[PDB]
Amino acid sequence: IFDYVIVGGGTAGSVLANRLSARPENRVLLIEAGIDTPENNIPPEIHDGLRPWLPRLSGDKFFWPNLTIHRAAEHPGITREPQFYEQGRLLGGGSSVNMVVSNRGLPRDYDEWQALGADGWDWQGVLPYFIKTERDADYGDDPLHGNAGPIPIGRVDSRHWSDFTVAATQALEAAGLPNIHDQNARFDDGYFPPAFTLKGEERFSAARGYLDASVRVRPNLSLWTESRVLKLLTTGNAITGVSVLRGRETLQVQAREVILTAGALQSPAILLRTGIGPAADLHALGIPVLADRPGVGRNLWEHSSIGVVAPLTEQARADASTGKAGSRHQLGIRASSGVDPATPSDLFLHIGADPVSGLASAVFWVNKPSSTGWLKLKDADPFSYPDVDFNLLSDPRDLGRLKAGLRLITHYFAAPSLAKYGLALALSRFAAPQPGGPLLNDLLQDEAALERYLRTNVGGVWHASGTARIGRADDSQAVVDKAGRVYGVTGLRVADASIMPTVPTANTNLPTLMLAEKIADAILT
Numbered sequence: 001i002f003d004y005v006i007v008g009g010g011t012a013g014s015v016l017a018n019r020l021s022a023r024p025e026n027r028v029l030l031i032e033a034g035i036d037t038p039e040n041n042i043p044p045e046i047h048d049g050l051r052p053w054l055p056r057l058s059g060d061k062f063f064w065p066n067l068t069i070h071r072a073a074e075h076p077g078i079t080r081e082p083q084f085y086e087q088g089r090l091l092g093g094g095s096s097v098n099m100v101v102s103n104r105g106l107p108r109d110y111d112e113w114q115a116l117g118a119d120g121w122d123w124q125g126v127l128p129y130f131i132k133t134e135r136d137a138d139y140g141d142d143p144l145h146g147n148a149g150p151i152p153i154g155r156v157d158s159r160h161w162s163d164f165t166v167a168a169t170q171a172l173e174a175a176g177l178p179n180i181h182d183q184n185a186r187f188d189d190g191y192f193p194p195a196f197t198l199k200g201e202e203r204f205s206a207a208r209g210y211l212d213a214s215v216r217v218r219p220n221l222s223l224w225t226e227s228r229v230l231k232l233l234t235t236g237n238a239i240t241g242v243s244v245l246r247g248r249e250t251l252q253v254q255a256r257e258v259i260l261t262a263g264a265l266q267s268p269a270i271l272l273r274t275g276i277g278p279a280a281d282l283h284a285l286g287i288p289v290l291a292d293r294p295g296v297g298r299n300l301w302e303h304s305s306i307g308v309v310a311p312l313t314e315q316a317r318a319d320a321s322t323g324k325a326g327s328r329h330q331l332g333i334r335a336s337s338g339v340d341p342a343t344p345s346d347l348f349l350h351i352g353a354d355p356v357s358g359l360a361s362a363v364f365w366v367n368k369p370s371s372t373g374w375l376k377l378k379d380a381d382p383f384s385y386p387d388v389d390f391n392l393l394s395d396p397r398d399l400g401r402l403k404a405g406l407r408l409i410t411h412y413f414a415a416p417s418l419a420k421y422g423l424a425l426a427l428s429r430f431a432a433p434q435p436g437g438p439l440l441n442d443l444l445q446d447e448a449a450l451e452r453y454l455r456t457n458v459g460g461v462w463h464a465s466g467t468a469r470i471g472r473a474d475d476s477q478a479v480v481d482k483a484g485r486v487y488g489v490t491g492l493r494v495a496d497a498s499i500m501p502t503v504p505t506a507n508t509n510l511p512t513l514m515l516a517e518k519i520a521d522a523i524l525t
C-alpha cells in the first residue's frame with residue numbers, strides 16, 4: 001500500500017512527492033495525467049525559457065484541452081462566452097507552461113491569511129518556506145532570502161535595459177516611483193527587474209527542480225505519468241485510495257492518505273465528486289454526501305487583467321532594440337489604484353516593446369482584487385470539467401481599479417520620456433495583445449462605453465486559487481485545516497493553489513511552491 005498518493009504532478013505535487021519521499025519509510029506514488037518531461041525529452045516548446053509564451057501557441061498539446069470557463073460576472077447588456085483557460089497537463093503542471101516569473105507577494109497578504117483563520121500562515125510563518133524553496137542568484141545571502149533551494153530566482157541587470165525600458169523608468173521616476181530592485185524582499189510601490197526562474201536560456205519547472213534524476217531513483221518513490229485519477233475511493237468517511245486510468249485500463253490503488261494537487265479548478269471538482277461539498281448541490285446530482293462542506297469550489301480568486309498597445313514608431317522600435325538581456329522579463333511595476341486604502345499595491349503593470357509584433361504595450365492586472373467567483377459540477381461524471389464562473393468585476397471596486405490603472409498608464413505615457421515616442425495607445429485583451437480595441441484617450445471619455453468594454457474584455461492571468469481554502473477549525477465555509485486536512489473526512493488532504501484563503505499580490509507559482517513546502521513540513525512533523 002502507498003503511504004501517500006499524490007494526485008497531480010504539477011508545481012505543488014512535485015514539491016510534495018520530493019519532500020515526502022526524502023523519508024525512506026514513506027512509500028509515495030505521484031500520479032500525473034500528462035506526459036513526463038524527463039531531462040532527455042523536454043518538449044522544445046516547454047524548454048525554451050526565453051520564449052515562455054510558446055506553449056500557448058502550440059494549441060492544446062500541453063494543457064487540459066477544451067477546458068472552458070466563464071470570466072466576467074454576468075451583467076445586463078453584455079453577453080459573455082465560454083473562454084479557454086490554459087492549465088498545464090504534463091509533469092511540472094503550471095511551472096512547465098507558465099510565464100516563468102517568481103514572486104512572493106506582500107507580508108500583508110499572508111498576515112491576512114492568518115487573520116482569516118489560517119493559523120501560522122502569516123508572513124512570519126510562510127517566509128521560512130519562501131526561503132527554503134529558492135536559490136536567489138542576486139540576493140541569496142541576504143536576509144529574507146535563500147541560497148540553497150531547488151528553484152533558482154534571478155533578475156536582469158538594470159544596466160542591460162533597453163533604451164525604451166529606461167524611458168519608461170524615467171516616466172515612473174517623474175511620478176515619484178523608485179526602483180525597488182528586489183520585489184521579493186521589498187514591499188512598497190515602485191518598479192523593478194522582475195524576478196524569474198530560468199537555467200540559462202532554459203525553462204526550469206518544478207519537475208526539473210524537485211523531480212531530478214536522483215530523486216527519481218529513490219526506491220520508495222513511484223512516478224506514474226500519462227495516468228489520470230478518476231475517483232477517490234472511500235470506506236465510510238475515510239478516503240482509502242484512487243481509481244486510475246492508464247490508457248484504456250482502470251486500476252484501483254490503495255492509499256493510507258491521498259493528497260490532491262490537481263490544480264485549483266480540478267482538486268475541488270474531485271472533492272465534489274467524492275461527496276465533499278455543499279450538501280444540496282451534491283443531492284442534486286445524486287452524490288452521496290460524506291461531508292456538508294459549503295466552501296468547496298467557492299472563494300475562486302484570480303487577477304483581473306486588461307491590455308493597452310500601440311504600434312511602435314521608428315524611435316520606439318530603435319530604442320526597444322538596445323536591451324542586452326534578450327527577451328527576458330525587463331520591467332515590473334507595483335502601484336496603488338487609490339480605489340480602497342485597505343489595498344495599497346493593488347495593481348501590477350508591465351510597460352515594454354516588442355519589435356516582432358510591432359507593438360508597445362502597457363498590460364496590467366488587479367493584483368489585490370475584491371471579486372470572487374465559484375465552480376460547481378456539471379454532472380457526477382469523472383470526465384466532466386466543472387462549471388467555472390470567475391465572476392470578475394462582480395465587486396465594483398475591481399472595475400474602479402481597472403479604470404484607475406488605465407488613468408495611471410495615461411499619466412505615465414504623458415511624461416516627456418514616453419511622450420516623445422508619439423504612441424497612440426489603444427485597448428486590448430490581455431492574453432494575446434492585438435489591434436481592434438478603441439483608443440485609450442477616447443474610451444476614457446465615455447464612462448458607459450469604458451465600463452462595457454472592460455466587462456466584455458476583462459481577462460485573468462492564470463492565477464486561479466482558493467477553491468479549497470484553509471480556514472479555522474470551526475468555520476463552516478473553510479475546506480482544509482492549517483496542514484491541508486479536509487474537514488469532515490479522514491485520509492485526505494489538499495495542498496495546491498486551491499488552499500489559498502485569498503490570492504496574494506503575486507503571480508501564484510512561487511506562493512504555490514511555498515505552500516507545498518509548508519504543508520510537506522506539517523505532514524512530516
Ligand SMILES: Cc1cc2nc3c(=O)[nH]c(=O)nc-3n(C[C@H](O)[C@H](O)[C@H](O)COP(=O)(O)OP(=O)(O)OC[C@H]3O[C@@H](n4cnc5c(N)ncnc54)[C@H](O)[C@@H]3O)c2cc1C
Nearest residue numbers: 008010011012033093094099100101229462496497507509
Ligand atoms: C499559461 C500560464 C501562465 C502563468 N504564468 C505564471 C507566471 O509567470 N508566474 C507564476 O508565478 N505563475 C503563473 N501562473 C500560475 C502558476 O503556474 C500556477 O498557479 C501553479 O502552477 C499552480 O500549481 P498547482 O500545483 O496548484 O497546479 P498545477 O501546476 O496546474 O498542477 C496540477 C497538475 O495536476 C494534474 N492533474 C489534474 N487532474 C489530474 C488527475 N485527475 N489525475 C492526474 N493528474 C491530474 C495536471 O495535469 C497538472 O500537472 C501561470 C499559469 C499558466 C497556466
